[PDB]
Structures are given as structure tokens and as C-alpha cells.
């Protein structure tokens, strides 16, 4: 599983990194290229991954 | 450092189809893509493409 | 002032002296406006602004999201309260709007019936304003970080784009040549800008920390490199005669065309002369800029002092083209400003950031 990931906004690939504040139990995916920044509740078992998905998915929602 | 002849014999076979060794066909490798590359660098090349 | 208006009238000081006075000091007096509003509608960050140069009322607004907002700045209604509202978007519906950010967006110069917008979709879309459909679509094999028509030309029609591929294209819109480009730059080409005094002069800054001045017409690739030292710091050319110690990712030619801005990652904004790339050593300060992308910054028009608008980090750095002494610090925004356009008529400033916010700057009183 990749930890940078291409961003759903300006399309650089792995231009996107992930934080994963578990303490805070919320994960942070910010574009380096666009600045775009997304914050999303995460839980022990989450990835980077699930960060980009709930990222991905706040998208095409906000986008309806 | 292109080795000589004798390190890469070319062995002739029952005919007259002369085999050259695993070196040899390597060295056509290093030569093709060495050639290909020297012109796209010389020329312009999408630095991607060069890389 | 009132000696002013008395000169005018007295004919002791040609109406140039209080027009431009009194703009400047319209410009020094840049506030938060107290009774402006710009309409909200890009859900993300405002890459880009362009006012139309002809009647300055119209505004084109790319957002991250893709979707290119067409505003009316004029204030039709009778309040002294009024929000510039959206009168066209290219919005997530449209059959044609871009798949990622919009990048920059440009009026058609001598016509405000055509305009144009490139978006790291690696596309630059020409669009008919009346119909608000593509007239054209220019394709290239990697993303555009900018694109400009030339302010000036009433021959050609050529739009220079600068994509992360180390070329700058020049697509003729005039019958679609996109296959001209122009060799010398080595990494991606940050920023593109013709000089509004010459037809075929064209200024590019790419990220290998180098700006290049180019004779389109030529076939000798650029005119000049533009260097920090001089000449101080000499080696043939093959690394040296750098524009900046970082990435150049912002170019503007001031209003007559003679001198150019350009600003850096290094956090520097260094001032040319534009006919031999001569470093002027104008000091400015640090300017802060980290950005990745484009840096889009305008100078101030028709004022007895030039300024130049420069987005500092979530606020804009006013300063003096030819001294380099700050004005100010317009202190509105929440994000980091990516882009502001001046309106020259009134002397008044529209910035567009990351905070899906276009903010509008007026003169006080
Ligand atoms: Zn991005």
C-alpha cells in the first residue's frame, strides 16, 4: 500500500501526504503541489489509504 | 571496457549459423539503447524520456 | 488636495499630475472594503483572476475544483452596498468544465467575446464568452502550470504555455498550431508572460531557477538569461546566469514593459531591466513565497508611483517597483493568497486564496 498518492485536484502524482495524529484519532491528507487539505476522523485500524479514500469520497460528495 | 574476441568466442555450429555468446548479445543491448540514447540526449528529449 | 483641484483648474499643473497623485494615494489608502461583496461559488481554493483590459468589468474566477466563475464587478444596483455577483460559470454540470484545478484564465485581449483557461487537466480550453462553450481544446503531454496571451498583438495570436515539460509551447490560434516550442529551459516552466511593450518578446521562468527572454519570431533560442550578479560570479553557460537560488515561479512586466518582477522560492522578488536582463539590485526584502505552482502578482497602472501587488503568505505585500519600500500589507485572508488582479481603473485589487474567498480591496474614502 502506497503512502504518497496522487492528488484528486491538481493530479501530481504522490504529491499527497498523510498524517496520522492518532492521539487526536484524525488523519490529515494535504497536497504538497495544490495545498489542498482534507482532516478525517480515523480509528487504530486506518492507513493512509483509508485517509485518501475518505478524502476521495468527501470529494465526490461535495462535488454532487 | 568492450572484452575481445576470445573472452566471447563465437562458436560455428554443425553449418555455417555462427552463435555469438551471452556477452556479445549483451554488449548489442549496451550499444542499441546506448546509441538510441545519445541521439535523444543530443537532440531534444522529454526529461523523463532521457531519464 | 484642494491644492490640487485648484492647480488643475488654474492650469498651474497638467491634469496627469492630479490624476496620477490622486491614484496613488487611492492605492496607499487600499482597505478591506467596507461595503463590497464578491459572490461565493468555487468549492475550493481561486488559483486565478483576470479583469478584462477592455472596460475593466467582467472578472474570470479558476478554482481548484475545476470550475471557472464569470463575475460582474459593476455595482448595477443603487445601494452603496452590493455583492459582485457571478453572471456565467463553466460549473461541475458543464459538459466541457475541466476534470482538475484551473490553473489560469485570460481574457481574450482586444475582445472581451472570447476567453481562454488551462488546468492541470493538460489542457488549455478556449471558450466563446456569449455561448459559454469550448471553441477549442489544446492538448499537451503533460500538466499546464501557466499560460498568457500576449497583451499587445494585433499580428499574431499566440498563447504561451508553460507545462512541467522543460519546453514552452506556443499554440497559434490563429489555424491550431500547438508545435512550436522553444528549447533552453531543464526543468518545469513555472510562469510565462509577454512583454506588453514588444509583440514577440516573451518571458519564462522555470524551476531550474532561470528566466529566459525569447524573440518568438527568432531561431536562436532566447534573447537573454537573466542573472543575479551580472557578471560577478562568471562561468560559461551551462548552470550558472541563474535568476534566482530556487525555483522561479512568478514574472511580471511592469506597466510600461521596460523592466520586469520576477519572484522566487528563494524569497526574493528581483526587478530586470528588460532590454539586456541587467539585475537592477532593487532590494524589496524577503518575500515569502513557497509555492509549488504558478505565483500569480500584478503591478499597479496610471499612478505616479508604480506598485506591485505580491501574495505574502495569507496577505498582499504592497510594494514600490523602483525603491523596493513596502507600502503595506493588505491583511484579509485566511489561506495563503494565490493570486491578485488589479483593477486599473479605480485602483482597486481583487485576491483570490486557498480559502474559497475572493477578496476585494478598495481605496478608503
Ligand atoms: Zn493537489
Known amino acids: 500500500l502506497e503512502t504518497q498518492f496522487t492528488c484528486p485536484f491538481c493530479n501530481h502524482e504522490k504529491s499527497c501526504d498523510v498524517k496520522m495524529d492518532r492521539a487526536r484519532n484524525t488523519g490529515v491528507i494535504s497536497c504538497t503541489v495544490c495545498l489542498e487539505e482534507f482532516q478525517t476522523p480515523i480509528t487504530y485500524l486506518s492507513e493512509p489509504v483509508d485517509v485518501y479514500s475518505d478524502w476521495i469520497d468527501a470529494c465526490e460528495a461535495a462535488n454532487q | 571496457p568492450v572484452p575481445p574476441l576470445s573472452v566471447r568466442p563465437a562458436v560455428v555450429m554443425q553449418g555455417s549459423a555462427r552463435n555469438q555468446d551471452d556477452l556479445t548479445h549483451k554488449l548489442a543491448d549496451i550499444v542499441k539503447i546506448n546509441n538510441q540514447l545519445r541521439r535523444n540526449e543530443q537532440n531534444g528529449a522529454a526529461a523523463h524520456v532521457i531519464a | ?365
Open chain 3, 1 to 365: 488636495m484642494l491644492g490640487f483641484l485648484s492647480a488643475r483648474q488654474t492650469g498651474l499643473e497638467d491634469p496627469l499630475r492630479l490624476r496620477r497623485a490622486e491614484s496613488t494615494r487611492r492605492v496607499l489608502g487600499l482597505e478591506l472594503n467596507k461595503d463590497r461583496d464578491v459572490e461565493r461559488i468555487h468549492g475550493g481554493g481561486i488559483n486565478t483572476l483576470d479583469i478584462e483590459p477592455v472596460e475593466g468589468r467582467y472578472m474570470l474566477s479558476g478554482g481548484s475544483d475545476g470550475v471557472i466563475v464569470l463575475y460582474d464587478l459593476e455595482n448595477s444596483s443603487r445601494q452603496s452596498y452590493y455583492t459582485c455577483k457571478a453572471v456565467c460559470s463553466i460549473g461541475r454540470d458543464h459538459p466541457d468544465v475541466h476534470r482538475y484545478s484551473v490553473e489560469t484564465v485570460q481574457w481574450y485581449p482586444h475582445d472581451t467575446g472570447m476567453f481562454t483557461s488551462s488546468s492541470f487537466d493538460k489542457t488549455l480550453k478556449v471558450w466563446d464568452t456569449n455561448t459559454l462553450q469550448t471553441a477549442d481544446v489544446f492538448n499537451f503531454e503533460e500538466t499546464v502550470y501557466s499560460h498568457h496571451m500576449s497583451p499587445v498583438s494585433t499580428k499574431h495570436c499566440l498563447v504561451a504555455v508553460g507545462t512541467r515539460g522543460p519546453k514552452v509551447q506556443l499554440c497559434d490560434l490563429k489555424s491550431g498550431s500547438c508545435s512550436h516550442i522553444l528549447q533552453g529551459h531543464r526543468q518545469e516552466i513555472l510562469a510565462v508572460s509577454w512583454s506588453p511593450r514588444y509583440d514577440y518578446i516573451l518571458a519564462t521562468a522555470s524551476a531550474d531557477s532561470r528566466v529566459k527572454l525569447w524573440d518568438v519570431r527568432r531561431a536562436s533560442g532566447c534573447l537573454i538569461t537573466l542573472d543575479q550578479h551580472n557578471g560577478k560570479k562568471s562561468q560559461a553557460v551551462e548552470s550558472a546566469n541563474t535568476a534566482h537560488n530556487g525555483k522561479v515561479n512568478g514574472l511580471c512586466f511592469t506597466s510600461d514593459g521596460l523592466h520586469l518582477l520576477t519572484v522566487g522560492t528563494d524569497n526574493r522578488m528581483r526587478l530586470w531591466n528588460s532590454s539586456n536582463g541587467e539585475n537592477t539590485l532593487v532590494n524589496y526584502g524577503k518575500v515569502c513565497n513557497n509555492s509549488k505552482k504558478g505565483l500569480k502578482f500584478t503591478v499597479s497602472c496610471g499612478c505616479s508611483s508604480e506598485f506591485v501587488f505580491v501574495p505574502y503568505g495569507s496577505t498582499i505585500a504592497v510594494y514600490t517597483v523602483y525603491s523596493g519600500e513596502q507600502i503595506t500589507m493588505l491583511k484579509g485572508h485566511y489561506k495563503t493568497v494565490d493570486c491578485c488582479v488589479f483593477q486599473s481603473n479605480f485602483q482597486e485589487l481583487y485576491s483570490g486564496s486557498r480559502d474559497c474567498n475572493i477578496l476585494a480591496w478598495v481605496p478608503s474614502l
